[PDB]
Amino acid sequence: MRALLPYLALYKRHKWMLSLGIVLAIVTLLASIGLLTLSGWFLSASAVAGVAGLYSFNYMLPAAGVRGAAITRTAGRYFERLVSHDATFRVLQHLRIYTFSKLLPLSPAGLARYRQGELLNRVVADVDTLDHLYLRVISPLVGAFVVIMVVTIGLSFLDFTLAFTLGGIMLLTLFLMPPLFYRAGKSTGQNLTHLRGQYRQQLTAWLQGQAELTIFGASDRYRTQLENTEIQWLEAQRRQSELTALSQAIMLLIGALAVILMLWMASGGVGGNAQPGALIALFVFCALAAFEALAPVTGAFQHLGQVIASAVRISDLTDQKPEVTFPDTQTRVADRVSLTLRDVQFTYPEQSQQALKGISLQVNAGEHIAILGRTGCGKSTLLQQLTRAWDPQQGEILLNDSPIASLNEAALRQTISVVPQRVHLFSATLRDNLLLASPGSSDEALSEILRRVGLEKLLEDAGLNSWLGEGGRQLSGGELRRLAIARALLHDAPLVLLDEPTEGLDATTESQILELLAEMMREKTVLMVTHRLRGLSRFQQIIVMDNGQIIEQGTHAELLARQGRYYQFKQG
Amino acid sequence: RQKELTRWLKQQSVISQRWLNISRLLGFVSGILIIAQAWFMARILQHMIMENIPREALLLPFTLLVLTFVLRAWVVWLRERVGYHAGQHIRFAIRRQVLDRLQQAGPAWIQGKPAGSWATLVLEQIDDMHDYYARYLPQMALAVSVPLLIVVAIFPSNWAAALILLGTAPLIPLFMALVGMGAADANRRNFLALARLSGHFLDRLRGMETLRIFGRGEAEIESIRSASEDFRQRTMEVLRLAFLSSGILEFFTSLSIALVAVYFGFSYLGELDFGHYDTGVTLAAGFLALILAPEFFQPLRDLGTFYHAKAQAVGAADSLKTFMETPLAHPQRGEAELASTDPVTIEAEELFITSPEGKTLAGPLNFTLPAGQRAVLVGRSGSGKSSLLNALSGFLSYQGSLRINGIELRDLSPESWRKHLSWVGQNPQLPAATLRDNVLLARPDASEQELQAALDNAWVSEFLPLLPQGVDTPVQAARLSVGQAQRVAVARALLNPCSLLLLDEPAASLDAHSEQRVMEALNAASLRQTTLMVTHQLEDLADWDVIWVMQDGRIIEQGRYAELSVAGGPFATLLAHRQE
Ligand code: HEB
Ligand SMILES: Nc1ncnc2c1ncn2[C@@H]1O[C@H](COP(=O)(O)OP(=O)(O)NP(=O)(O)O)[C@@H](O)[C@H]1O
Ligand SMILES: Nc1ncnc2c1ncn2[C@@H]1O[C@H](COP(=O)(O)OP(=O)(O)NP(=O)(O)O)[C@@H](O)[C@H]1O
Ligand SMILES: [Mg+2]
Ligand SMILES: [Mg+2]
């Protein structure tokens, strides 16, 4: 329960409404106990009085409590569900922002080891299970504590050796059972999230390699392997449901032990009088109705083990040290940046392959550059070095005759605008997908840039407010590439380095943007990286690299005239 | 059609009907024991309150009361283990049904979605339906047994008390169903706006690098703040009414304990006398109604707490029903088997090989490849070249007659045919534990000498020492470069002799060193058996016995390279490749 410390400090921001949602969970749980205890005594008090003493018996005060203890049992429950769900939703906001803030400096490098689709579905699932802490673990356990105390202090007035037994039995089952079952299920919980991940990798391997597995005959013996991890996985689940069933047979036997004891012990005498009279049904109906407060406690040993596991998975993810750090020094962003490389080497962490070995190049101001190479040659990795996603081992990068490690983080984003290979379409509006680049751009200027990229079709039917993204209006692959270039125009950086534009297009539209790149970014040092050769005559100093090293470079004619690698794979 | 989902879910229930009948049965035995432990308490309490009998005298009813609490605990333990066993029997049976569907559809349909997205449909969309069968559905059958048993056990004692509980029986569903109105006024206008805000956090996580590039990281936090806050106050218009349905149930369980207390409490006082059967109102007849009034509404209150069990299993069943119902074109299979391990001859005419959805992929085509002859297949991007290789592998269903060594393919048994077929593929996958099990995928029991020759022939040993753990290195663990993941996928293709070899694209997406290294091992490996290799580079194709050209799924060319090149008809050799 040490893992929860960074996240129990986010609750403290909303401590004064979390407690209100808890107090209502105590007033409601006290009306339920009070209504059944008062009614139980009232039947026994009146029946003992009988017909003979009906006039002396006052049936107007208890009948005023019942009218009151029933209007707080239903108004409290309605407000305990709102005020508690309201508090859970407000804590979620502080958890979404906290997770995003810590996962932001680690975005390219701290998450490269995992699977981005698989990881980011785990992180969203984890932040959801931290909300369960208040509703499933804290409110059921804190609320069940002060309910026991007040129904022990309250019944302490009538007698003490009795009210202590309810206090005793109900508090040990509150303090001893949640630990003794969390501890018992600790072994399977770690053995159940291991077999779930194991079954997920074996299923992904089976489904992906569905073409290779069938042909070589192995599609059957990797299904049996997959179906045998499931069998073990479904015994870890069973050993975990046989432990939720056991924690329900204990709270029902413990609840029996309290009722049987107050049926026996309260028979001897309640307080002074040896015969208790109606008070023997006040104790028994309190013992019977008090274990309503501890019904949520039965299942809170499981919902705690999930939050502990989730707080570990997300404190691990967000406590990684960033692979790059930016100086605090201020600087003035300057146009016409002349980028240079001097023998930068790079090896991805936990790996032996050198993904980028001994690459060096020179890009003067205004000098468009094209980098060409096969798939998996490390061209996009060279472009991660320039945006400071990683740091090159034993290398040196200079941006306008000064090291790029000396630029302020905010200033660096101003002097380098990139067009990512995987263009991302945020779910927000079109205006919010273009103000992404420049936040203060006017609505009119934002329209004409999107007009000049040749994406006029998006300006129809109130396009600037249309909801494109995951919700609807999904852009095609062809016109999603035109959107990224639109952002790189709003941002207006002196150096605009592109990563495989004109990829996945057709011949007629890829010549549109590739002309657009050299039409408006004439004053920019482009440094385009593509594996598709087209219209490279406008680019000077074409650079060809294979396997993380520049094979040969020069102007378009020079590699074509000279017998070289570029000339070789140009034709044929 | 949210009702049709629930209809489907209940349809799936029949798998473990023997287990959901014990849970239904034990919801009756656990309803009798609740009545027994209430009658015994009422009979014990009356004696010590009215007759002042000492506790040690009425020792027998205590023993039956203790024995009733032990039995009731045992049944609640029991019907939780039966309930789970019901749940993990539908899940174990749907998952097998889903996996069988995926295996039959073949690789052609699996590649329609990322393999991280077929795992949600199997790992999470299946596990989500557990709480609907383990907990919610047995509890739905406990919410009609115990309430009826409670009333039926009170009616002999006092029909007025049995009418206070049953009086709220029609008034509870009426008001909750009146709150159903308000779930069509708050979950209807907010259905859209509240669906653009569920994936608002994930979509900003998926694009952090895009946010980091433009430096908008600290200004998209305010967009999480302004979309999470709006999601809160959008979804309380729903919850300011959907919690009334909870308030109604908690109100009527308070009015039902109030009325039973007020009616009984006055009945002993003699103020009102209408309930009992003119036999006096014993105290036990009153305790038996206070002990059972919370129990009457207890299963229905717990059924409220199983909302999220129902909430998950309706979202999960949404995507599962569509998948299970889509029409698919699984390849037609037979039991014919050919025992000629020698190179086969493929013949085809009018092959309209068809994708799983039913759309035609490659149009009419006619060709013939004699045994021992290797035939490059070249064409423009998407011209039916890659599909023609799947069709010979069995992943696609064809229309016309195709013959393999004088026998048709559709009636050829895939398990026996694919023992004579070896292929590489484009974007090859290594679906095994290590780099040693991937090479030995054809025969896992291969000797070290045979494995060592395969690694050397495909030149896997060049990059082998510079790997961490050697030949047993796991492959997340050690991301082999594509130049090396294509050389282990080619040491596996030619590990064992075959009859037909199909190299989809061996030299593409490869570095300069492995290009001349793989092909050096795949020009020797293409002589031994018929090989239908597919490439886009014709620089060195003269040695190849035949060359085919496909455009828009139609084959248009034959003959060797020498006679075709000088032919100057539909020849793409003069066109410089654009994806190089
Ligand atoms: C729809 C929307 C919604 C949502 C979103 C939600 C979200 C949520 N939730 Fe909820 N709920 C609901 C709606 C809802 N909900 C309802 C309606 C109910 C009813 C129930 C009663 O009545 O009470 C509940 C109920 C409930 C409960 C109670 C039950 C028991 O006790 O077991 C709980 C605990 C919860 C938790 C929760 C959580 C944690 C969350 C996350 C944060 N929830
Ligand atoms: N995130 C990563 N973690 C570990 N190894 C990686 C990672 N990315 C790439 N590699 C390895 O190093 C190479 C880097 O490839 P990369 O330079 O990103 O490709 P590219 O030249 O951009 N071509 P493409 O994959 O088509 O976009 C890969 O082929 C792997 O061998
Ligand atoms: N599930 C599918 N399987 C095969 N083809 C599909 C599928 N869905 C759509 N298609 C289309 O089928 C047509 C045939 O493409 P295909 O012949 O497989 O291309 P290819 O030879 O793989 N091209 P390339 O890989 O660039 O050499 C194309 O229009 C595909 O986009
Ligand atoms: Mg790339
Ligand atoms: Mg292909």
CSV table of C-alpha atoms in Angstrom, one decimal, chain A residues 35-36 39-40 42-44 46-48 50-51 54 59 66 70 73-74 77-78 81-82 85-86 89-90 93 96-97 100-101 103-104 107-108 111-112 115-117 120-121 123-124 196 199-200 203-216 218 221-223 226-227 230-231 233-234 237-238 241-242 245-246 248-249 252-253 256 259-260 263-264 267-268 277 280-281 284-285 288 350-353 374-375 387 413 418 422 424-428 436 439 467 487 491 531-533 547 569-570 572, chain B residues 41 44-45 48-50 55 59 62 65-66 69-70 72-73 76-77 80-81 84 88 91-92 95-96 99-100 102-103 107 110-111 115 118-119 122-124 127 196 201-218 221 224-225 228-229 232 235-236 239-240 243-244 246-247 250-251 253-254 257-258 261 264-266 268-269 271 283 286-287 290-291 294 301 395 418 421-424 428-429 431-432 441-442 444 466-467 477 479 484 492 507 509-511 537 576-580:
chain,number,residue,atom,x,y,z
A,35,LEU,CA,-34.8,2.4,11.6
A,36,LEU,CA,-34.5,-1.3,12.2
A,39,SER,CA,-38.7,-0.6,15.1
A,40,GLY,CA,-37.4,-3.7,16.7
A,42,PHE,CA,-40.9,-0.6,19.4
A,43,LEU,CA,-42.6,-3.9,18.7
A,44,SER,CA,-41.1,-5.4,21.8
A,46,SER,CA,-45.5,-2.1,22.9
A,47,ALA,CA,-46.1,-5.8,23.0
A,48,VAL,CA,-44.7,-6.0,26.6
A,50,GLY,CA,-49.8,-4.8,25.7
A,51,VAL,CA,-53.4,-3.7,25.8
A,54,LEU,CA,-51.6,1.4,25.9
A,59,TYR,CA,-46.3,6.0,20.6
A,66,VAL,CA,-39.4,6.4,12.2
A,70,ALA,CA,-36.8,6.8,6.9
A,73,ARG,CA,-32.3,6.8,4.8
A,74,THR,CA,-33.6,7.6,1.3
A,77,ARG,CA,-28.7,7.4,-0.2
A,78,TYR,CA,-29.7,9.6,-3.1
A,81,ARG,CA,-24.6,8.4,-4.7
A,82,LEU,CA,-24.4,11.9,-6.3
A,85,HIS,CA,-19.9,10.1,-8.0
A,86,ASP,CA,-19.3,13.8,-8.3
A,89,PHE,CA,-15.4,12.5,-11.4
A,90,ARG,CA,-13.4,15.4,-10.1
A,93,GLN,CA,-9.7,15.1,-13.8
A,96,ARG,CA,-5.9,12.5,-16.1
A,97,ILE,CA,-3.9,15.7,-15.8
A,100,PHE,CA,-0.6,13.3,-18.9
A,101,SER,CA,1.8,15.8,-17.2
A,103,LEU,CA,3.9,11.1,-19.5
A,104,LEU,CA,4.5,14.2,-21.6
A,107,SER,CA,6.6,10.6,-24.9
A,108,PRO,CA,8.9,9.4,-27.6
A,111,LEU,CA,7.4,4.6,-24.1
A,112,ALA,CA,9.4,3.1,-27.0
A,115,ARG,CA,3.5,-1.3,-27.6
A,116,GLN,CA,1.9,2.1,-28.0
A,117,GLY,CA,-1.5,0.7,-28.9
A,120,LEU,CA,-1.9,3.5,-23.9
A,121,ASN,CA,-5.0,1.2,-23.5
A,123,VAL,CA,-2.7,3.5,-19.0
A,124,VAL,CA,-6.3,4.6,-19.7
A,196,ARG,CA,-3.1,-12.7,-18.8
A,199,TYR,CA,-1.9,-15.3,-23.1
A,200,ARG,CA,-2.0,-12.0,-24.8
A,203,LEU,CA,-2.6,-14.8,-29.0
A,204,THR,CA,-1.0,-11.9,-30.8
A,205,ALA,CA,1.8,-14.1,-32.1
A,206,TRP,CA,-0.8,-16.7,-33.2
A,207,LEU,CA,-3.0,-14.2,-35.0
A,208,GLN,CA,-0.2,-12.2,-36.6
A,209,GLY,CA,1.8,-15.3,-37.7
A,210,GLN,CA,-1.5,-16.9,-38.9
A,211,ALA,CA,0.0,-17.1,-42.4
A,212,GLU,CA,3.3,-18.6,-41.4
A,213,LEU,CA,1.9,-20.9,-38.8
A,214,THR,CA,-0.6,-22.6,-41.1
A,215,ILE,CA,1.9,-23.3,-43.9
A,216,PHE,CA,4.6,-25.0,-41.9
A,218,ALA,CA,2.5,-25.3,-36.6
A,221,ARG,CA,0.6,-26.9,-31.8
A,222,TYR,CA,0.7,-23.1,-31.1
A,223,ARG,CA,-3.0,-23.2,-30.6
A,226,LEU,CA,-2.2,-20.9,-26.4
A,227,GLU,CA,-5.2,-23.0,-25.1
A,230,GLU,CA,-5.8,-20.1,-21.0
A,231,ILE,CA,-6.5,-23.2,-18.9
A,233,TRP,CA,-5.2,-18.5,-16.6
A,234,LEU,CA,-8.7,-19.8,-15.9
A,237,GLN,CA,-9.3,-16.7,-12.0
A,238,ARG,CA,-11.0,-19.6,-10.2
A,241,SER,CA,-13.3,-16.5,-7.2
A,242,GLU,CA,-13.0,-19.3,-4.6
A,245,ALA,CA,-16.8,-16.8,-2.1
A,246,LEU,CA,-14.9,-17.5,1.1
A,248,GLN,CA,-18.7,-13.9,1.8
A,249,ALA,CA,-19.1,-17.1,4.0
A,252,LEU,CA,-22.1,-14.2,7.0
A,253,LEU,CA,-20.7,-16.5,9.8
A,256,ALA,CA,-24.2,-14.9,12.8
A,259,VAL,CA,-26.5,-12.2,16.5
A,260,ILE,CA,-26.1,-15.4,18.4
A,263,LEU,CA,-29.3,-13.4,21.7
A,264,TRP,CA,-27.4,-15.2,24.4
A,267,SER,CA,-30.5,-12.7,27.8
A,268,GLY,CA,-28.6,-12.6,31.1
A,277,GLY,CA,-37.4,-6.8,28.6
A,280,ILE,CA,-32.9,-7.6,24.4
A,281,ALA,CA,-34.5,-6.9,21.0
A,284,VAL,CA,-30.3,-8.2,18.6
A,285,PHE,CA,-31.8,-6.0,15.9
A,288,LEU,CA,-28.6,-8.1,12.8
A,350,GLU,CA,18.3,-2.5,-24.4
A,351,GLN,CA,19.6,-3.3,-27.8
A,352,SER,CA,22.8,-4.3,-29.6
A,353,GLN,CA,22.0,-3.3,-33.2
A,374,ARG,CA,15.0,1.5,-48.0
A,375,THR,CA,12.6,0.5,-45.3
A,387,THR,CA,13.6,16.9,-32.6
A,413,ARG,CA,9.8,23.8,-31.0
A,418,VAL,CA,8.1,18.6,-38.6
A,422,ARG,CA,2.1,8.8,-38.9
A,424,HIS,CA,-2.4,12.1,-36.1
A,425,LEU,CA,-5.9,13.4,-36.4
A,426,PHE,CA,-7.0,14.8,-33.0
A,427,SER,CA,-10.7,14.2,-32.2
A,428,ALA,CA,-11.3,18.0,-31.8
A,436,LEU,CA,-2.5,23.2,-32.9
A,439,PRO,CA,-2.4,29.1,-31.2
A,467,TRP,CA,-15.9,17.5,-35.8
A,487,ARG,CA,0.1,22.5,-39.8
A,491,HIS,CA,3.9,26.8,-37.3
A,531,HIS,CA,11.8,6.3,-49.6
A,532,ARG,CA,9.8,7.2,-52.7
A,533,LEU,CA,11.7,8.8,-55.5
A,547,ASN,CA,21.4,0.3,-42.8
A,569,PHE,CA,17.7,1.3,-57.9
A,570,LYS,CA,16.3,4.3,-59.8
A,572,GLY,CA,14.7,-1.7,-62.4
B,41,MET,CA,-35.1,-15.8,16.0
B,44,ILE,CA,-36.5,-17.4,20.5
B,45,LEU,CA,-37.1,-13.7,21.0
B,48,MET,CA,-37.3,-14.4,26.4
B,49,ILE,CA,-39.4,-11.3,26.1
B,50,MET,CA,-42.9,-12.6,26.9
B,55,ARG,CA,-31.6,-18.8,27.8
B,59,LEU,CA,-31.2,-24.3,24.2
B,62,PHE,CA,-30.4,-21.8,19.5
B,65,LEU,CA,-30.5,-21.3,14.7
B,66,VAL,CA,-26.8,-21.8,14.8
B,69,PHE,CA,-26.6,-19.8,10.0
B,70,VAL,CA,-23.9,-22.4,9.1
B,72,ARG,CA,-26.9,-20.3,5.0
B,73,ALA,CA,-23.2,-19.4,4.9
B,76,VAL,CA,-23.8,-18.5,-0.1
B,77,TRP,CA,-20.3,-19.9,-0.5
B,80,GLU,CA,-20.8,-18.2,-5.6
B,81,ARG,CA,-18.6,-21.1,-6.8
B,84,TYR,CA,-18.5,-18.4,-11.3
B,88,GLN,CA,-16.2,-19.2,-17.0
B,91,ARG,CA,-16.4,-17.4,-21.6
B,92,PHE,CA,-14.4,-20.5,-22.3
B,95,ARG,CA,-13.6,-17.7,-26.8
B,96,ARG,CA,-13.2,-21.0,-28.5
B,99,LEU,CA,-10.9,-18.4,-32.2
B,100,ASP,CA,-12.3,-21.1,-34.4
B,102,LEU,CA,-10.7,-16.5,-36.8
B,103,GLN,CA,-8.7,-19.7,-37.8
B,107,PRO,CA,-4.9,-14.9,-42.6
B,110,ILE,CA,-7.2,-11.4,-39.8
B,111,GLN,CA,-5.1,-8.7,-41.5
B,115,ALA,CA,-3.6,-7.9,-33.9
B,118,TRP,CA,-8.3,-8.8,-32.1
B,119,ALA,CA,-6.9,-9.3,-28.6
B,122,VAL,CA,-10.8,-12.1,-27.1
B,123,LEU,CA,-9.1,-10.9,-23.9
B,124,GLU,CA,-11.4,-8.2,-22.7
B,127,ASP,CA,-13.9,-11.4,-19.9
B,196,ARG,CA,-16.9,12.5,-28.0
B,201,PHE,CA,-8.1,11.3,-22.9
B,202,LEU,CA,-6.9,8.4,-25.0
B,203,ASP,CA,-6.7,10.5,-28.2
B,204,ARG,CA,-4.4,13.0,-26.4
B,205,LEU,CA,-2.3,10.1,-25.2
B,206,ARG,CA,-2.1,8.6,-28.6
B,207,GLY,CA,-0.8,11.9,-30.0
B,208,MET,CA,1.7,13.1,-27.4
B,209,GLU,CA,4.5,13.1,-29.9
B,210,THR,CA,2.4,15.3,-32.2
B,211,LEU,CA,1.8,17.5,-29.1
B,212,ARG,CA,5.4,17.4,-28.1
B,213,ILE,CA,6.6,18.4,-31.6
B,214,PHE,CA,4.5,21.6,-31.6
B,215,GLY,CA,5.1,22.4,-27.9
B,216,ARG,CA,1.4,22.2,-27.1
B,217,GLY,CA,1.9,19.9,-24.2
B,218,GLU,CA,1.1,22.4,-21.5
B,221,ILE,CA,-3.6,19.9,-20.5
B,224,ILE,CA,-8.1,17.7,-20.8
B,225,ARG,CA,-9.3,19.9,-18.0
B,228,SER,CA,-13.1,16.2,-18.2
B,229,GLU,CA,-14.9,18.8,-16.3
B,232,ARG,CA,-18.6,15.4,-15.3
B,235,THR,CA,-23.1,12.9,-17.1
B,236,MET,CA,-24.8,14.2,-13.9
B,239,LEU,CA,-27.2,10.6,-12.8
B,240,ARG,CA,-29.5,13.2,-11.1
B,243,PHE,CA,-30.1,7.7,-9.0
B,244,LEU,CA,-33.7,8.4,-8.3
B,246,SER,CA,-32.0,4.0,-6.5
B,247,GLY,CA,-33.8,6.4,-4.2
B,250,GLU,CA,-34.4,2.8,-0.7
B,251,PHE,CA,-37.6,4.8,0.0
B,253,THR,CA,-37.7,-0.4,1.8
B,254,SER,CA,-38.0,2.4,4.5
B,257,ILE,CA,-40.2,-1.3,7.6
B,258,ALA,CA,-42.0,1.7,8.9
B,261,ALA,CA,-43.4,-1.5,12.6
B,264,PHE,CA,-47.6,-4.2,14.4
B,265,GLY,CA,-46.7,-1.8,17.1
B,266,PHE,CA,-50.2,-0.5,17.3
B,268,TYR,CA,-50.2,-5.1,20.2
B,269,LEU,CA,-51.4,-1.8,21.7
B,271,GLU,CA,-55.4,0.7,18.7
B,283,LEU,CA,-44.8,-11.2,19.2
B,286,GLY,CA,-44.1,-9.3,14.4
B,287,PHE,CA,-40.4,-10.1,14.7
B,290,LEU,CA,-39.2,-7.0,10.9
B,291,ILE,CA,-36.5,-9.6,10.3
B,294,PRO,CA,-35.1,-5.9,4.9
B,301,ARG,CA,-31.1,-3.8,-3.7
B,395,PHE,CA,-6.0,-18.4,-47.7
B,418,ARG,CA,0.5,-27.3,-47.2
B,421,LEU,CA,4.1,-25.8,-50.0
B,422,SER,CA,6.8,-23.5,-48.5
B,423,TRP,CA,6.7,-19.7,-48.8
B,424,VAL,CA,8.4,-16.5,-47.5
B,428,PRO,CA,7.2,-11.8,-42.7
B,429,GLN,CA,6.4,-12.7,-39.1
B,431,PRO,CA,5.6,-16.4,-34.5
B,432,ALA,CA,7.8,-18.4,-32.1
B,441,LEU,CA,9.3,-24.2,-37.4
B,442,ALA,CA,8.9,-26.8,-40.2
B,444,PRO,CA,10.8,-28.8,-34.3
B,466,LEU,CA,26.5,-10.0,-32.7
B,467,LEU,CA,23.2,-10.9,-31.1
B,477,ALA,CA,13.5,-8.7,-26.5
B,479,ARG,CA,14.2,-6.3,-32.3
B,484,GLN,CA,17.9,-10.0,-40.4
B,492,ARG,CA,12.8,-21.4,-42.3
B,507,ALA,CA,14.6,-8.7,-51.9
B,509,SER,CA,12.6,-3.7,-47.8
B,510,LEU,CA,16.1,-5.2,-47.4
B,511,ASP,CA,19.4,-3.5,-47.0
B,537,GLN,CA,12.8,-5.4,-60.2
B,576,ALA,CA,11.5,3.4,-63.4
B,577,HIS,CA,10.1,2.2,-60.1
B,578,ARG,CA,8.5,4.9,-57.9
B,579,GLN,CA,8.6,3.1,-54.5
B,580,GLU,CA,12.3,2.3,-54.6
